Write an enzyme that holds these catalytic residues in place. Structure first.
Site, PDB file in Angstrom:
ATOM      1  N   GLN A   1       0.986  -1.206  -0.082  1.00 49.84           N
ATOM      2  CA  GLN A   1       0.146  -0.025   0.297  1.00 49.84           C
ATOM      3  C   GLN A   1       1.016   0.961   0.106  1.00 49.84           C
ATOM      4  O   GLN A   1       0.638   2.064   0.186  1.00 49.84           O
ATOM      5  CB  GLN A   1      -0.674   0.167   0.635  1.00 49.84           C
ATOM      6  CG  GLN A   1      -2.485  -1.594   1.482  1.00 49.84           C
ATOM      7  CD  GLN A   1      -3.290  -0.804   2.188  1.00 49.84           C
ATOM      8  OE1 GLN A   1      -3.626   0.448   2.589  1.00 49.84           O
ATOM      9  NE2 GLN A   1      -3.038  -1.581   3.478  1.00 49.84           N
ATOM     10  N   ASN A   2       2.112   1.000  -0.144  1.00 49.67           N
ATOM     11  CA  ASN A   2       3.068   2.146   0.183  1.00 49.67           C
ATOM     12  C   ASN A   2       3.907   2.619  -1.475  1.00 49.67           C
ATOM     13  O   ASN A   2       3.566   2.339  -2.584  1.00 49.67           O
ATOM     14  CB  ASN A   2       4.489   1.872   0.877  1.00 49.67           C
ATOM     15  CG  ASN A   2       5.470   2.813   0.506  1.00 49.67           C
ATOM     16  OD1 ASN A   2       5.794   3.539  -0.575  1.00 49.67           O
ATOM     17  ND2 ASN A   2       6.015   2.501   1.768  1.00 49.67           N
ATOM     18  N   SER A   3       3.159   4.202  -0.967  1.00 52.20           N
ATOM     19  CA  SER A   3       2.546   4.950  -2.810  1.00 52.20           C
ATOM     20  C   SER A   3       3.998   4.950  -2.965  1.00 52.20           C
ATOM     21  O   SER A   3       4.493   5.436  -4.273  1.00 52.20           O
ATOM     22  CB  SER A   3       2.296   6.043  -2.171  1.00 52.20           C
ATOM     23  OG  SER A   3       2.443   6.832  -1.502  1.00 52.20           O
ATOM     24  N   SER A   4       5.109   5.399  -2.443  1.00 48.10           N
ATOM     25  CA  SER A   4       6.485   5.522  -3.063  1.00 48.10           C
ATOM     26  C   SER A   4       7.473   3.943  -3.516  1.00 48.10           C
ATOM     27  O   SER A   4       7.762   4.555  -4.475  1.00 48.10           O
ATOM     28  CB  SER A   4       7.896   5.897  -1.512  1.00 48.10           C
ATOM     29  OG  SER A   4       7.676   4.910  -0.621  1.00 48.10           O
ATOM     30  N   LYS A   5       6.328   2.888  -2.636  1.00 48.83           N
ATOM     31  CA  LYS A   5       6.745   1.384  -3.493  1.00 48.83           C
ATOM     32  C   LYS A   5       6.578   1.758  -5.185  1.00 48.83           C
ATOM     33  O   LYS A   5       6.820   1.339  -6.085  1.00 48.83           O
ATOM     34  CB  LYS A   5       6.381   0.991  -2.483  1.00 48.83           C
ATOM     35  CG  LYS A   5       7.446   0.289  -1.460  1.00 48.83           C
ATOM     36  CD  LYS A   5       7.128  -0.339  -0.742  1.00 48.83           C
ATOM     37  CE  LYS A   5       8.604  -1.182   0.420  1.00 48.83           C
ATOM     38  NZ  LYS A   5       8.319  -2.081   0.939  1.00 48.83           N
TER      39      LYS A   5
ATOM     40  N   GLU B   1      -0.979 -11.140   7.492  1.00 48.05           N
ATOM     41  CA  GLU B   1       0.141 -11.047   8.812  1.00 48.05           C
ATOM     42  C   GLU B   1       0.961 -12.065   8.245  1.00 48.05           C
ATOM     43  O   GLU B   1       1.666 -12.766   7.487  1.00 48.05           O
ATOM     44  CB  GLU B   1      -0.935 -12.040   9.254  1.00 48.05           C
ATOM     45  CG  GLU B   1       0.464 -11.729  11.177  1.00 48.05           C
ATOM     46  CD  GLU B   1       0.168 -12.673  12.217  1.00 48.05           C
ATOM     47  OE1 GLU B   1      -1.380 -13.070  12.466  1.00 48.05           O
ATOM     48  OE2 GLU B   1       0.554 -12.549  13.073  1.00 48.05           O
TER      49      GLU B   1
ATOM     50  N   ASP C   1       9.894  -7.991   1.102  1.00 45.12           N
ATOM     51  CA  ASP C   1      10.030  -7.141   3.036  1.00 45.12           C
ATOM     52  C   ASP C   1      11.614  -7.116   2.652  1.00 45.12           C
ATOM     53  O   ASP C   1      12.391  -7.303   2.550  1.00 45.12           O
ATOM     54  CB  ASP C   1      10.104  -8.765   3.799  1.00 45.12           C
ATOM     55  CG  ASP C   1       9.860  -8.449   5.167  1.00 45.12           C
ATOM     56  OD1 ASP C   1       9.443  -6.973   5.280  1.00 45.12           O
ATOM     57  OD2 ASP C   1      10.463  -9.002   5.947  1.00 45.12           O
TER      58      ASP C   1
ATOM     59  N   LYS D   1      20.365   7.964  -2.460  1.00 46.73           N
ATOM     60  CA  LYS D   1      20.085   6.841  -1.792  1.00 46.73           C
ATOM     61  C   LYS D   1      19.279   6.057  -3.121  1.00 46.73           C
ATOM     62  O   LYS D   1      19.724   4.267  -2.110  1.00 46.73           O
ATOM     63  CB  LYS D   1      18.672   7.276  -0.497  1.00 46.73           C
ATOM     64  CG  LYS D   1      18.884   6.501   0.528  1.00 46.73           C
ATOM     65  CD  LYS D   1      17.645   6.607   0.830  1.00 46.73           C
ATOM     66  CE  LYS D   1      16.894   5.021   1.920  1.00 46.73           C
ATOM     67  NZ  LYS D   1      15.246   4.908   2.185  1.00 46.73           N
TER      68      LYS D   1
ATOM     69  N   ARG E   1      16.935  -1.376  -1.862  1.00 51.34           N
ATOM     70  CA  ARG E   1      16.169  -1.454  -2.179  1.00 51.34           C
ATOM     71  C   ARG E   1      16.248  -1.228  -4.221  1.00 51.34           C
ATOM     72  O   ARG E   1      15.569  -2.298  -5.172  1.00 51.34           O
ATOM     73  CB  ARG E   1      14.578  -0.492  -1.861  1.00 51.34           C
ATOM     74  CG  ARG E   1      13.857  -0.739  -1.066  1.00 51.34           C
ATOM     75  CD  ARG E   1      12.887   0.192  -1.221  1.00 51.34           C
ATOM     76  NE  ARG E   1      11.995   0.721  -2.288  1.00 51.34           N
ATOM     77  CZ  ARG E   1      11.014  -0.374  -2.583  1.00 51.34           C
ATOM     78  NH1 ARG E   1      11.062  -1.296  -2.206  1.00 51.34           N
ATOM     79  NH2 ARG E   1      10.662  -0.337  -3.284  1.00 51.34           N
TER      80      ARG E   1
HETATM   81 CA   LIG Z   1       7.368  -6.412   6.859  1.00 51.25          CA
END
Ligand SMILES: [Ca+2]
Ligand SMILES: [Ca+2]
Lengths: 197, 197
Positions: free
Chosen positions: A9-13, A40, A69, A177, A183
């Site tokens: 759900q991470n917008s930057s990702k 989970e 992850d 970075k 990443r």
């Molecule tokens: Ca995690």
């Protein structure tokens, strides 16, 4: 157009990914667009969690799915916080709090070795039954600083000293970075495979 | 000298390893030297099972541990037998029984596409709590034959057609198979990493 579901759900990702594969005919769709709930993370390795999340997304959507992850591993702390990177200072804690717990932990371990690494593991599943997902593993080696420094980034960035740059991750310009990080390396491995395909 | 536990009772796999890393100062010790009980593979991916086995060996022995999981994936069968490669026609089925089961599954699917691939995933864990094990993944592309042929190898080899060689895996000289197979590739990846380390 190849459609791949992004578990995050991470917008930057998502943005980093779109930038990465801008020249390929692939469209990433956040799992939220299929109303897929978070699952989970119960694994003890990044790769296990990456698979857990990608398999979940693929199962619910019927499309290929990609998840990652990540975490910080510290040699003197037997690779902690590791998969507990986000949970290291309890629930509802801040980045600042987590930074302090890491600093205290090293202080207490009184181990001259400040060695540490950031890890990013990406898993791409063709579907939920895929037994051989593409695994991309990015590793960024550095040292834990004595005190937080730097205005950029997030999480443990302020205490992650990058020997090659003689600056912490938080001191680096965002673009720099993202080019050399765990990443960045995982993403370049992924791009190489996808581009070749 | 560095000691690594091999989570496998297979004598050929141990021999291959010793042969591979003969120039390195590493001793591989089969987990049987520690009386490690075998554990159950519950993963849906080779990597998950490799990690399970490696993690178990490391916990029981107190040493770093290396394990692998391997299987045959067939496109027309949605990557089956996959992680069930060693269970495909029953836990106690002969190699010949599994081969026949695969051939029957294929002719039932009525798919002109006989594409398949062997997979070997190796995982090396520093200890049971290692969140970032080394993962090596060797992949061998081929096709499923219509009938078994060849005197060498084992398992599914007699029906794994290798287009580059115009023979099945079982027809190849053992030295040629080992140089190009999913295992040979995974081992070369491991050797590169361990050597440079
Ligand atoms: Ca995690
Ligand atoms: Ca197995």
């Amino acid at each position: 157009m190849l459609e791949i579901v992004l578990a995050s759900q991470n917008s930057s990702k998502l943005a980093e990914m779109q930038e990465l594969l801008r020249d390929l005919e692939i469209k990433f769709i956040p799992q939220t667009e299929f109303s897929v709930p978070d699952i989970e993370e119960t694994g003890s390795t990044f790769v296990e969690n990456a698979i857990i999340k990608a398999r979940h997304a693929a199962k619910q959507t019927g499309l290929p799915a990609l998840a990652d992850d990540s975490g910080l591993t510290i040699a003197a702390l037997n690779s902690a916080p590791g998969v507990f990177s986000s949970r290291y200072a309890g629930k509802n804690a801040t980045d600042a709090e987590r930074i302090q717990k890491v600093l205290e932990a090293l202080e207490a371990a009184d181990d001259s070795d400040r060695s540490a690494s950031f890890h990013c593991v990406i898993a791409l599943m063709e579907n939920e039954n895929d037994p051989a997902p593409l695994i991309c593993h990015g590793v960024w080696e550095g040292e834990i600083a004595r005190e937080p420094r730097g205005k950029n980034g997030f999480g443990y960035d302020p205490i992650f000293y990058v020997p090659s740059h003689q600056r912490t991750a938080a001191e680096l310009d965002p673009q720099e970075k993202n080019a050399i990080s765990h990443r960045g390396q995982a993403l370049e491995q992924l791009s190489t495979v996808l581009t070749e395909a």
